[PDB]
Amino acid sequence: DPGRGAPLAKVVFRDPYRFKKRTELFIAAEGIHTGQFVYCGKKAQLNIGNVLPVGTMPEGTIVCCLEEKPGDRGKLARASGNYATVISHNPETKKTRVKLPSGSKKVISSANRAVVGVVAGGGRIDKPILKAGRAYHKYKAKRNCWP
Amino acid sequence: PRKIEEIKDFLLTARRKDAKSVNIKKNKDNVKFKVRCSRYLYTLVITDKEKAEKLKQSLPPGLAVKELK
């Protein structure tokens, strides 16, 4: 997806109340490869690139593309290779604490979903761009504000 | 145009109620029949001079014109 070092993934689902094929663009976790069965919901077991709501995943499980508030379809920790860690639930008041990529610990509402595993494309900023032009071509593909 | 490679066609392609004219031109050695129809110039190559006179009379109506050469 131009203007992003985290390549997406065209997942194909099935509408269970009509008849057609629905497609999405998940941020692709790392390890995901085509022809793979990605699950989605509350009773889908732990494995990489498989969304399940924080609260039904054990303490210490690394997630990405974590939602802020239930239903906004992914907002936190979704850059090119970042990951939010779950820390410790609180099965009363139904809350959870995540350690976002910056380091600030958040008291996130539970029941909001997050695809497991780090985001593919990691380790991007380890190559010196080395050129004036190579930075130019990078910022031309995004909001046009380079020099 | 269309190439036609026998005789029986040349009548079924020239007995039609819409056909317009027949051109029987004497190329240097073969013969060329060209019946003009509404969509094609149905050309028959026959290489026998002593067979064109057989096919000159046998045209469906008396119409043997207009020929050139």
Add this chain to the structure above:
Amino acid sequence: VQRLTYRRRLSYNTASNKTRLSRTPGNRIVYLYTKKVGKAPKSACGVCPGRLRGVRAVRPKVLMRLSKTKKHVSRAYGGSMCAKCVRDRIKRAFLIEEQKIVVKVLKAQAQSQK
């Protein structure tokens, strides 16, 4: 010696202006404007790179003309699941399709026996 001209009124070497030359009976080399050569279909599988054999390759709107035998292959799933897939995915369908239904039978057995 060549003194040629675009015969139409467009004079910019764009994509819909490519040309080929020819030699008219009056012995005059003149342009002729060529219709672009389209590409034959691909597989509906999506994971095979080659094109279809059997399906005539021509621009889209020309397909209003050709007979149905020129636009597909008598094979089931013809002209949409590639001829490599006709050798692969139509293979790979049955082998995937029959057996997976057969496994459902096996699991309907071991579960029901108990």
Add this chain to the structure above:
Amino acid sequence: AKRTKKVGIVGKYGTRYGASLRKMVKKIEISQHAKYTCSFCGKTKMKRRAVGIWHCGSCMKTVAGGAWTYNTTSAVTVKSAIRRLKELKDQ
């Protein structure tokens, strides 16, 4: 080798950009270009396609791995723990 003593791939840059920048790049323009072995076939035909996406040559399977390497060692240890956490979640 014999053509160049201590540059390698980054000899296509000449006397520019300095020394230490080119040394740091020489370890990245070797990882990314070189062909890995696709785990689904064993045929060393897994070549980087764009940033963070990899393509095979014979299986025709794209794998979303690291940005200059088939896997970043954190992404492997994350795959590690999630396996271990899967038994504890289900005893």
Add this chain to the structure above:
Amino acid sequence: RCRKNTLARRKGRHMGIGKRKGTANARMPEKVTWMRRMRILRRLLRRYRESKKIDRHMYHSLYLKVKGNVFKNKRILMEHIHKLKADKARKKLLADQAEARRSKTKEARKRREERLQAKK
């Protein structure tokens, strides 16, 4: 006036060192001079393999060797075959003479002992 010149350029005139301005590559490139040589030492190489003067195994090694230009024209390949193929033969004649004698007396050893075990 241009033909009379070109019929002299073919022979060697007007083409010394005083009539060259282009680089040695420009007059006749190195990529082409190599390229046309691989298509001659490969073509000859596979006109021999099917003609059965060399065999599968030799056609491989000669294929890698010519790729590292240890053979620089056709004659020195036509000859370097006449050295290998010839000394391969003499080794065979001293190989199919060694085992023919070695075993004949070995089964003739096996026969002479069997005519012993019958006659006690």
Add this chain to the structure above:
RNA sequence: CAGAUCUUGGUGGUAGUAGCAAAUAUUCAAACGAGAACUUUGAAGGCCGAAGUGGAGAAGGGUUCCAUGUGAACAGCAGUUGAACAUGGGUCAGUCGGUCCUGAGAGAUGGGCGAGCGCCGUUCCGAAGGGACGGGCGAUGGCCUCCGUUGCCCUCGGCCGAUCGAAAGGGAGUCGGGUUCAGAUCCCCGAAUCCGGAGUGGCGGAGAUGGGCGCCGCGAGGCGUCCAGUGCGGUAACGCGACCGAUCCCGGAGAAGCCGGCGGGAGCCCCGGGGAGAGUUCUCUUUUCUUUGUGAAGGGCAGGGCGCCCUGGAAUGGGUUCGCCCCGAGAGAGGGGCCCGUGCCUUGGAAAGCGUCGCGGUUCCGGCGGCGUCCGGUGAGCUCUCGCUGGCCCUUGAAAAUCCGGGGGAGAGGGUGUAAAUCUCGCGCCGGGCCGUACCCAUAUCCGCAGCAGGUCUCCAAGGUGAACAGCCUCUGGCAUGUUGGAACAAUGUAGGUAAGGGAAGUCGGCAAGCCGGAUCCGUAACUUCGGGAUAAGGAUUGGCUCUAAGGGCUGGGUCGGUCGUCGGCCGGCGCCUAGCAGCCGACUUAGAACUGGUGCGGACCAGGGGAAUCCGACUGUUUAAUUAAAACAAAGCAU
């Protein structure tokens, strides 16, 4: 009114003065004419020299286009000419574009805001669909058979945004010959094609024609009853001429960058022969020069491409490219299938075109005839196109209209001579509105106050030397030296050159011009981020003419006897192209040698002066359009 650098109008001296100098160049004769340095024809000498002083277009101009005529005015001299002036004439489309589609964006209703013209906003706080198959009923119509048709209802439908936005993107199908003072894919002649209609079926062919049983009849065959038939071939890729089908779902085409390599095809060039016409023949030249074809759409076949199938299973690993690459996830090897087919033959097509030689129409015919449009070969050549395969990205390189294939089976159809359907199979009929269409496209028709050395988007792209679209000369084509001529040859200029001896002594400063300047063969330092420095520096050679050596393609295998028409198909018998030889063609190249020249030889043109240090900026890049091109800004890197 004397004035105000006064307002408007007018006229002088300057002054018959400055000036009519950017890009080589004109001359002789003739014609109309009152008149000729300039107009027109002819002869000669020159240039633009295919990145054009050529042949066409888009913006823009708007009648400048073409013809007849004029000598007021303008064309900075003149003019018999014009881009001027006065009359007339000219722009022909189903297929060339516009219209259709969406792109960055623009925009209205719903909503919100606003004293207010209105504004924000584009799925966003909206009852946003006006359409369809079938079915039940009422109801006409025309042979109220049957179907075309109509109103109510039952069903079905996602509303995912009205509209606008490209004469270069997407977007079906037209080519050849001729024709006028100006138009020609537009007109005439001749060949084709797309779309739409087909309604009572305009006609053929296809789905459609079986089997058993019982009768009789020798049989040919016919007599009757059941039940079938919405097509066949190939193991396979797939093929055949059509071969029912909806709501719904899936996918494909439309539909993707830049660069490098290689190969196929074609146009141009080149070489060798035949012809037809030509310039030279003072002497030589089987002579040098022009010319030597076949459209669209079908049909057949060469030629490229395949990540298509089948047999079999490979390490004493192979095959294979310029580089690669691929292989038990099935190599080589044999057989087949598909796609592209711009190429060759053929229908069009010799009738036409073209080159010559000859008649008729004394005249305005687009007339009549003889001959020909033949046979070859090379290529790292150039241009255009097609197809493989790599490289580069922290760049991954357009949307929609439209058209298509697949799945699924709601429905239709007839009961044994015929149906319903043809993702039209071959034909046949009818229709294709509307607007643009001349010309210039630039040292003259455009913008700069003009016939201004400025500026303004593209296609076509010959011969020679040469690395080359460099520079220079020539052919097809074009022109009169760019708003004038004549006579001389002073100074000062402007633009070019050379100069004895010294060589920066000149000057703020080697400012300017001057040396070096290509290529082959030798040789190459301090420094260094080990890549560079480097064409470092510094040497030698270069002409002609005659030779030498080396670097390649295509073809090959026997007397003998009978049969078949020592020559050949066959047999049997032999040969064993057995070391690899023999014959025919074929392109430019590289190294060496002899001889010769007033030692000249990258002989015009094109083509670097070097070395040792200091300061500054890392570099490539950018800027003060019209005085500052830098040490200024940017920049990757570092860090808050």
